[PDB]
Amino acid sequence: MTDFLAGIRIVGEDKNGMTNQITGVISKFDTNIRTIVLNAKDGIFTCNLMIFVKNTDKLTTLMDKLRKVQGVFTVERLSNLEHHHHHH
Amino acid sequence: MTDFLAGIRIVGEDKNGMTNQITGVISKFDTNIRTIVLNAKDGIFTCNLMIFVKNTDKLTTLMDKLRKVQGVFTVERLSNLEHHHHHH
């Protein structure tokens, strides 16, 4: 009701540590991770975070928390989700 | 000096914190996350870890580290991978 499944997408440079620190920061959030897909390809990584929030302001707040990492250049919201029968 | 892309499959009960702690433990490893995919289905969640390891012993050790979690009941190795990693 007040809660909904919110989505985030993080694209940053694939360094020996960034992929670890990024999802680490995510795992220590206030909310519970129901889905997350990070893949480092070619030289960049895209970490798609899926968590439940009480409001949109909560979602925009997480963005700023992720933008604290200098290695990341894109922190964006996922309006259209990948959540349906058969996920891969 | 060997090093291969090792995959791991973790299935545990979707609890208030498990999904967070599980990937949080993963970030603590001596290896860089190349791909991580966590998703909950029906009261359960499956997290797939994709990382690099020098030796198969280094990989079996990661299992034992993940198997320390009471909320998890399956910790397996992903042999058949969709990771077409080549040069053109």
How far is C-alpha B43 from the chain's CA centre?
A: 19
Residue B8 region by backbone torsions, left for phi larger than 0, else alpha for psi between -120 and 50, else beta: beta
* Three-state secondary-structure class, residue B48: strand
Domain range annotation of chain A: 1-88
Helix axes A18-27, B18-26, angle to 10 degrees: 160
Exposure string for B2-20, b = 16+ CB within 10 A, e = fewer: eeeebbbebebeeeeebbb
CB B14 within 8 A of CB B45: yes
CB A55 within 8 A of CB A63: no
Which residue carries 């998703």 as its tokens?
B39
- Interface contact B20-A40, CB threshold 8 A: no
Q: What is d(CA A1, CA A27) in angstroms, rounded to the nearest whole number?
A: 24
Exposure string for B36-55, b = 16+ CB within 10 A, e = fewer: bbbbbeeeebebbbbbebee
Q: What distances in angstroms separate CA A68 from CA A12, A22, A61, one per listed residue?
A: 12, 10, 12
Residue A61 amino acid letter: T
* Three-state secondary-structure class, residue A28: coil
Q: What is d(CA A70, CA A53) in angstroms, rounded to the nearest whole number?
A: 25
CATH topology of domain A1-88: Alpha-Beta Plaits (3.30.70)
- For an interface test with B, give the residue of A27, A81, A84 to mutate (most B CBs within 10 A): A27
- Which residue in chain A is spatially nearest to B21 when comparing CA positions? A27
CA angle A45, A50, A56 (to 5 degrees): 115
- For an interface test with B, give the residue of A14, A15, A33 to mutate (most B CBs within 10 A): A33
